[PDB]
Structures are given as C-alpha cells and as structure tokens.
Design a protein around this ligand. Structure first.
Ligand code: ACP
Ligand code: MG
Ligand code: MG
Length: 332
C-alpha cells in the first residue's frame, strides 16, 4: 500500500505493546538487507563476532532455542578498542531502533561485597531500598535490550552469580520481590584478559611458547567450562588490519563531511593524509580509541582556522595532503 506504510502500522502496534518497531518487523527488515550487512555498515571487520551474533538471533527467531533463556549470550575476548562496544551499540540500534536499548554495566564498578545491592537493589531495611537496582530497573523499563557487561572477570563473585542466574533462568527477582524478564535480551560479556600479557611478553622478547602458555593459564584461572558452556559463542576479537583502520577513518569522518556539506564544502584527502590519520589514530594498547581526538586535532582544528580566516570558503573543494608539520590544505 503506497500511502500507509509498514512502518506506520508497526509504530501503532509498537506504542500499544512496548515491542520495538524493528522487532515487530524483524521479518521485513531482514528482507531489506541481512543483519550481517547492516551491522557491517558500522562495524569494520570482526566478521566472526558479527556471524556469531547473527547466527544466534536466527536460531532464536526460527524457534530452535530455549524460550526461557535470553536471546543469546557471548563472551568477547581479545584486545581493547577494536569494535566490541561498536558492535553492541550497532546491535542495539539495529534490533531495537536506538542505542538507548544498550544497557552498559562496567564490572570495575562492581568489585566489592556491596555491589550486588547496587546491581539488583538494597534489601528491605537498608538505605536505597526504594531506588532498586541499576540493572533490574533498566531491564524492567526496556525488556528489549542489549546488555553489555565489561571486564567480567573483575566482578565480585556474588555479582558474577547474578549473571549466571540471567543465563540459566532468563529472569531475575529484584529486592522488591518483582520478577525482571530477560528473555528478550542479548547478553554481551567482554574481557581484555590475556591481551596486556601478550604485549608484555613481546616487549620483553619472550618466546612465542612462553607467551602462549601464560595466556591459557590466566584464561583458565578466570573462565571455567561451567561458565563458558552457558554461552552461545566465545569470540576472540582480532587486531585491525591497515585497510580496516583506513575504513574506520572514513567512517569517523562522516559527521565532519556532513557538517561541511551544509556550507557546500567538501574534503578530498590524498592517500598520504588518510594514512597519516590511521597511523596516529590506532595502536595495540588502545586500539582505535585515539582516532577521534587525532581527527579533532590534526584535521578539524586547522580546517576551522582556514574557514574562519576565509581561506576555505562556501563551495570549496579542499585538497588535504601531508606536509612537514602535519596536514596541509589546498584550494584550487
Ligand atoms: N571494528 C570497528 N569498526 C568500526 N569502528 C571501530 C572498530 N573498532 C574500533 N572502532 C572505533 O574506535 C572506537 C573504540 O571502539 P570500541 O568502543 O568498540 O572499543 P572497546 O569497547 O573495546 C573500548 P573499552 O575497552 O574502553 O570498552 C569506536 O568508538 C569506533 O569509533
Ligand atoms: Mg567498550
Ligand atoms: Mg570499560
């Protein structure tokens, strides 16, 4: 029907039921473009992680999974800054229409004995009883959510046990005795464990065998089969290739190009200029975390100066290259 669209009808049903539009339309959304391709618009590489997530969602939709557990659960190992959160955010926006559907719990904030009360609510008779838990209240308000637990090995054992309850039961009972349904959640657990150790061993000149033995020993110390067996998949994120970093540079320039387009200004970067940003914006210690401020300092700031001086004007095609002091700008 031309005048009344699929989205029009889904929005009515969405507001009446609380079910996200993209969830109601899951059968149409996948016809438009497959989930993997949609996630890859924002997530570069990490093909294995994307396939793991998409495969779980597919098994769930097809009616092959336990209806009393979450949609899927994953442990994302490997280094920092190479897409674990980029994937969780994109997944939330794609499945549930907004990044507000991603609930983030940083386990470095849940290391102590009283963390459970922060997580699921203080007991009756203790300060903070009416406020409830950070996790339980968030999931009650948004049953259709991606839940990101960061640095899971750091959680106090009592907090870890509540995670296990989510995996096993598909639900939690909060301090008010209310049940909190997790059946429509996707659970993503992250850990860096082993990555700093590898960098340390490479720095010290350790033989590969020694590095390898130490990584497995630390993983064994924190992650037992009883826990791992509960998960759909364990995925080790990989360091990014040179080409992958370049693709990320281009994505991270999207907003800037858009702002410039309002004034009919465009940017044309030499391959050298692109590589300049890629080199400074990525390293093994922080992944691509540095890139945002590299673009800010190396490109946006001097471009801003040129614009304010009137050296770059409305309608200009700006050529961006490398010079002795940093990026250089030319206009024909
Ligand atoms: N695979 C990828 N695809 C697209 N962008 C990526 C990417 N990996 C990293 N980035 C970029 O670098 C930033 C850091 O990525 P991300 O937040 O996914 O890492 P992370 O969750 O491991 C950091 P932390 O350990 O602090 O949580 C992202 O915001 C994004 O701009
Ligand atoms: Mg993160
Ligand atoms: Mg963190």
């Amino acid at each position: 029907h031309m005048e009344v669209t699929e989205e029009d009808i889904a929005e009515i049903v969405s507001r009446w039921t609380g079910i996200p539009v993209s969830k109601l339309l899951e059968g149409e959304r996948e016809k438009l473009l497959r989930l993997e391709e949609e996630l890859h618009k924002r997530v570069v590489g990490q093909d294995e992680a994307i396939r793991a997530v998409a495969d779980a969602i597919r098994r769930a939709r097809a009616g092959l999974k336990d209806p009393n557990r979450p949609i899927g659960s994953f442990l994302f190992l490997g280094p920092t800054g190479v897409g674990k959160t980029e994937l969780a955010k994109t997944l939330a926006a794609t499945l549930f229409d907004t990044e507000e559907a991603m609930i983030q719990i940083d386990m470095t904030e849940y290391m102590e004995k009283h963390a459970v009360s922060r997580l699921i609510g203080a007991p009756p008779g203790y300060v903070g009883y009416e406020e409830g838990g950070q996790l339980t209240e968030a999931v009650r308000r948004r049953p259709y959510s991606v839940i990101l637990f960061d640095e899971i090995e750091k959680a106090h054992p009592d907090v870890f046990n509540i995670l296990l309850q989510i995996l096993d039961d598909g639900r939690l009972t909060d301090s008010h005795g209310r049940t909190v349904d997790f059946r429509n959640t996707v659970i993503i657990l992250t850990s860096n464990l082993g990555s700093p150790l590898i960098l340390e061993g490479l720095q010290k000149g350790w033989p590969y065998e020694r590095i390898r033995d130490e990584v497995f020993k630390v993983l064994q110390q924190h992650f037992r089969p009883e826990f791992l067996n509960r998960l759909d998949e364990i995925v080790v994120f990989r360091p990014l290739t040179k080409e992958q970093i370049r693709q990320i540079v281009e994505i991270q320039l999207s907003y800037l190009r858009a702002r410039l387009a309002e004034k009919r200004i465009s940017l044309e970067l030499t391959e050298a200029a692109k590589d300049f940003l890629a080199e400074r914006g990525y390293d093994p210690v922080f992944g691509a975390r540095p890139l945002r401020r590299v673009i800010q300092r190396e490109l946006e700031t001097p471009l801003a100066q040129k614009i304010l001086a009137g050296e770059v004007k409305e309608g200009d095609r700006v050529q961006v290259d490398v010079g002795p002091a940093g990026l250089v700008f030319a206009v024909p």
